[PDB]
Curated annotation (Swiss-Prot), chains A, B:
It comes from Thermococcus kodakarensis (strain ATCC BAA-918 / JCM 12380 / KOD1). 5-phospho-alpha-D-ribose 1-diphosphate binds at residues 74, 77-78, 82, 84-87, 101-109, 113. Keywords: Amino-acid biosynthesis, Aromatic amino acid biosynthesis, Glycosyltransferase, Magnesium, Metal-binding, Transferase, Tryptophan biosynthesis. Mg(2+) 2 binds at D217, E218. This is Anthranilate phosphoribosyltransferase. Gene3D superfamilies: Nucleoside phosphorylase/phosphoribosyltransferase catalytic domain, Transferase, Pyrimidine Nucleoside Phosphorylase, Chain C. The gene is trpD.
Length: 325, 325
């Protein structure tokens, strides 16, 4: 109510106040949660607010011990139904470095990455100890957010009932309890680039890219991508598809997680639609760059492309098998 | 859902959408009520939104068949500051014209109009038929908001849990179901002047004064009073005690509805403290002017003051007698 009055008055919360707010929401009646989420969304976000809420959400999560990991994500998925490039990007990145992909419920309350990974044969809820074995054996695991954030249990039905976007759509990608050192975070509108970048700074990420490509929460293979790079301060620049060494190409629509899975798998084995391949590769390139395995985006695409083939399909089947053990 | 998304996007609702919003609120779960009230407060409400909400509230209320009636009110500061001039003004105005005073829709009503009128011996809970009969034979009745606004009953426990100001701390004086032709509405902040005046415009009031005097939702007998007059469009002017024909005097605080009623009753009978008498009279003059009883504020004060004395205390007795029968 005090924090609610401050928000309703248009005042931005401090990092500490936002950390407190998560713990208040955690134990609040639905009426108060609804009020906080609608008011907060009407006001808008600062980086300090996103980071405080996200840090409190990590601290309340099921604990993970996965070492130094990378993640790639979007606050949506969002917009059109295109293939799930953050999932494909995370799988390609595991050829190079440890990945713990956080999943990351959509506005429908379902995780698009969780549906795609299930279609690729994963059991998507794994224990913390299964997750550690997955990373140690394959460099990859999937952390399904509803399973790792029991504190959100009273919040989920409120988010469902309100139907509007809320702060939880933005902090989802910031709330990975593995504490990723490296992150790609796509955002669904350009006004979120600066607060999300500042929040990653507040959270101590070693290197991150916050991207907004052709109006979507991903790197575009077709038009310009706005980028904020975090790690030496915050740097702003714009990428074009030519910076990755591809010709511009428009992504093609997708109707179901099953189709999304099949098209991603075909790319991973070195085949697939050229439009899917180049869309996946520019996003994989950004993940390799953010995790320091590539020095620039042209090299990141070149290295990601060389990893596709039979070995990548073999990695995928052992990830699937290990997740069901 | 749709109206909530419009509000949290910062878009102002049309009159007809604000009408729908009220009818959506009254049948909504607390979670959605809480989100709607907090988001609209964060955005800020407009005159058009206040009017649509208020018209839907009037249309949902218990039906009244009073005549052409007048009302005087405050939005509201504190339940302990000054004596309740709007109740005194309403009683005095009934010597000249039909008055249906609308009670306060906020949970406080501490030294509110309802408390003061009971401390003056009225039964404030009258059925629609006693109300008509009271008006026909004394020119005065009082509309108890909790009993005339059933649709508010789900809303009230949400307002209590939120503990913030909402649009309902403001909409009350615009929501008189007897559709007053004449109104004085004090507002507690200068920023309420324009939207409340606009709202009265949209709602078709024949003549109204929206007033803010010396920082309070009332006419000041001490300092300047900002006035918006609604009728021929909207006219703006500033009054001073000189415009009522009195020397400036500072109104003084009171502690309880009982002391408020005793100090008002002494004025009504022709005595009382000079500070209370001239405070009541400048507000009574505003209501005589808004009602077309008096042509200007000097005359309104003159006419109000000559109605005080034994006959006024006898009118109060008859009002109280009839309200109990």
């Amino acid at each position: 109510m005090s924090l609610l009055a401050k928000i309703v008055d248009g005042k931005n919360l401090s990092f500490e106040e936002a950390y407190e707010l998560f713990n208040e929401l955690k134990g609040s009646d639905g009426v108060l949660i609804g009020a906080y989420l609608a008011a907060l969304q009407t006001k808008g976000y600062t980086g300090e607010e996103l980071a405080g809420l996200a840090r409190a959400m990590r601290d309340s999560a099921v604990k993970l011990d996965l070492g130094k990991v990378a993640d790639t994500a979007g606050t949506g998925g969002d917009g059109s139904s295109t293939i799930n490039v953050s999932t494909a990007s995370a799988l390609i990145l595991s050829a190079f470095t440890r990945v713990a992909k956080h999943g990351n419920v959509s506005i429908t309350s379902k995780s698009g990455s969780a549906n795609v990974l299930e279609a690729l044969g994963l059991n998507i809820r794994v224990s913390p100890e299964r997750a550690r074995e997955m990373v140690e054996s394959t460099n990859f695991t999937f952390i399904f957010a509803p399973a790792y954030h029991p504190a959100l249990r009273p919040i989920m039905p409120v988010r469902k009932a309100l139907g509007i976007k809320t702060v939880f759509n933005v902090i989802g990608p910031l709330a990975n309890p593995a504490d990723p050192a490296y992150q790609v975070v796509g955002v669904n509108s350009p006004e979120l680039l600066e607060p999300v970048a500042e929040a990653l700074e507040f959270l101590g990420v070693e290197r991150a890219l916050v991207v907004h490509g052709s109006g979507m929460d991903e790197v575009s293979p077709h038009r310009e991508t706005l980028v904020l790079e975090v790690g030496n301060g915050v740097e702003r620049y714009t990428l074009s598809p030519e910076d990755f060494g591809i010709e511009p190409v428009k992504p093609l629509p997708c109707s179901s997680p099953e189709e999304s899975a099949a098209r991603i798998k075909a790319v991973l084995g070195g085949s697939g639609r050229r439009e899917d391949r180049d869309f996946i590769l520019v996003n994989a390139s950004a993940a390799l760059y953010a995790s320091g395995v590539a020095e620039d985006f042209r090299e990141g695409l070149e290295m990601a492309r060389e990893a596709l083939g039979q070995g990548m399909l073999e990695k995928l089947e052992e990830i699937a098998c290990l997740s069901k053990s």
